[PDB]
Design a protein around this motif. Structure first.
Motif, short mmCIF file in Angstrom:
data_model
loop_
_atom_site.label_atom_id
_atom_site.label_comp_id
_atom_site.label_asym_id
_atom_site.label_seq_id
_atom_site.Cartn_x
_atom_site.Cartn_y
_atom_site.Cartn_z
N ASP A 148 -55.10 -58.35 -65.37
CA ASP A 148 -54.24 -59.52 -65.41
C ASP A 148 -53.34 -59.63 -64.17
O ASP A 148 -52.94 -60.73 -63.83
N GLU A 149 -53.03 -58.47 -63.62
CA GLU A 149 -52.10 -58.40 -62.48
C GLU A 149 -52.59 -57.28 -61.59
O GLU A 149 -53.03 -56.23 -62.04
N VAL A 150 -52.40 -57.48 -60.28
CA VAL A 150 -52.72 -56.48 -59.27
C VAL A 150 -51.48 -56.24 -58.43
O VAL A 150 -50.89 -57.22 -57.95
N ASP A 151 -51.13 -54.96 -58.31
CA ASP A 151 -49.99 -54.56 -57.46
C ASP A 151 -50.60 -53.92 -56.21
O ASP A 151 -51.10 -52.80 -56.26
N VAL A 152 -50.55 -54.64 -55.10
CA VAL A 152 -51.13 -54.17 -53.84
C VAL A 152 -50.03 -53.58 -52.96
O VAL A 152 -48.92 -54.11 -52.96
N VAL A 153 -50.37 -52.50 -52.25
CA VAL A 153 -49.38 -51.93 -51.32
C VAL A 153 -49.47 -52.68 -50.00
O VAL A 153 -50.48 -52.71 -49.34
N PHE A 154 -48.29 -53.18 -49.57
CA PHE A 154 -48.09 -53.80 -48.26
C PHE A 154 -48.33 -52.75 -47.18
O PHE A 154 -48.00 -51.58 -47.36
N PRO A 155 -48.87 -53.17 -46.01
CA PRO A 155 -49.06 -52.24 -44.89
C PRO A 155 -47.74 -52.01 -44.18
O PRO A 155 -47.50 -52.53 -43.08
N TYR A 156 -46.93 -51.18 -44.79
CA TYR A 156 -45.55 -50.99 -44.33
C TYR A 156 -45.54 -50.20 -43.04
O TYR A 156 -44.66 -50.44 -42.20
N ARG A 157 -46.45 -49.24 -42.85
CA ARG A 157 -46.47 -48.50 -41.60
C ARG A 157 -46.81 -49.45 -40.47
O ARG A 157 -46.27 -49.29 -39.37
N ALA A 158 -47.72 -50.40 -40.70
CA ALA A 158 -48.03 -51.35 -39.64
C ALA A 158 -46.81 -52.19 -39.27
O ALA A 158 -46.58 -52.47 -38.10
N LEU A 159 -46.01 -52.58 -40.26
CA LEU A 159 -44.81 -53.36 -39.99
C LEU A 159 -43.80 -52.54 -39.19
O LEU A 159 -43.20 -53.06 -38.25
N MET A 160 -43.71 -51.25 -39.52
CA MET A 160 -42.79 -50.37 -38.82
C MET A 160 -43.27 -50.17 -37.38
O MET A 160 -42.46 -49.85 -36.49
N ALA A 161 -44.56 -50.40 -37.11
CA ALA A 161 -45.13 -50.35 -35.77
C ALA A 161 -45.16 -51.73 -35.10
O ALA A 161 -45.82 -51.92 -34.09
N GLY A 162 -44.46 -52.71 -35.68
CA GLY A 162 -44.27 -54.02 -35.07
C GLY A 162 -45.35 -55.05 -35.38
O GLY A 162 -45.32 -56.14 -34.82
#
Length: 241
Positions: A90-104
């Protein structure tokens, strides 16, 4: 505290086949049902069977993808999301690419979330986006990840995986809910706290943040969720179970 505890219980995403079945049983509590259960994708079919058999078909089934790593391979995250949908989420919790964001790299987070949202929306599945506030650390990065996720179509923004050292804090919760408010998306975007909510007293405080920002009617199951080790037991204890 009793009123806040009942409210929080009904907002929980409660997280072998025998253990999945037990989880489904535990979601059907003496004082009401949790909002959802949260399992790995492969467990969705047996969970659905169990929820139906016990007469709680309205308990949602959430799962996780791109998890817990938040890697920046869109095609893998999308395949996993499509599989979760196909299993029956019913729902999907996906992980954001946070390391990529921290790398700009802001764009890959947008693209990843958007791809997953398009798949989910086509199937009437809700998408939550885990930004991993405990790894981002910085207010500006937490805001940015929240903003990008929202712009890409997240239906919820979620603090944490529960798989790193630092999960939700009241401050990271406040920051994320302020982004929802500031962007004017409170009707369409919910907030989910993972970790940092060990007790009924903690749950009350996290709910109070939402009540203060948006008004006390905002935090329904479409707009607010909880997941944490030990929380259900604490809530039930507060309620006399």
């Amino acid at each position: 505290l009793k009123a806040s505890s009942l409210r929080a219980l009904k907002l929980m995403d409660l997280s072998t086949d025998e253990k999945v079945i037990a989880l489904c049983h535990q979601a059907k509590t003496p004082v009401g049902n949790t909002a959802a259960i949260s399992v790995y994708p492969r467990s969705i079919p047996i969970a659905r069977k169990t929820l139906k058999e016990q007469g709680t078909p309205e308990i949602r089934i959430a799962t996780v993808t791109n998890f817990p790593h938040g890697n920046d391979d869109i095609e893998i995250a999308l395949a996993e999301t499509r599989a979760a949908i196909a299993y029956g989420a019913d729902e999907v919790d996906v992980v954001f690419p946070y390391r990529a964001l921290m790398a700009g790299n802001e764009q890959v987070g947008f693209d990843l979330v958007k791809a997953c949202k398009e798949a989910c929306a086509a199937a009437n599945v809700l998408l939550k986006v885990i930004i991993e506030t405990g790894e981002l650390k910085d207010e500006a990065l937490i805001r940015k990840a929240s903003e990008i996720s929202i712009k890409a179509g997240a239906d919820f923004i979620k603090t944490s995986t529960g798989r790193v050292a630092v999960n939700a804090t009241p401050e990271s919760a406040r920051i994320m809910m302020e982004v929802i408010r500031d962007m004017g998306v409170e009707k369409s975007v919910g907030f989910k706290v993972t970790g940092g909510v060990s007790t009924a007293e903690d749950a009350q405080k996290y709910l109070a943040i939402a009540d203060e920002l948006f008004g006390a009617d905002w935090a329904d199951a479409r707009h607010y969720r909880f997941s944490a080790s030990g929380l259900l037991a604490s809530l039930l204890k507060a309620l006399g179970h």
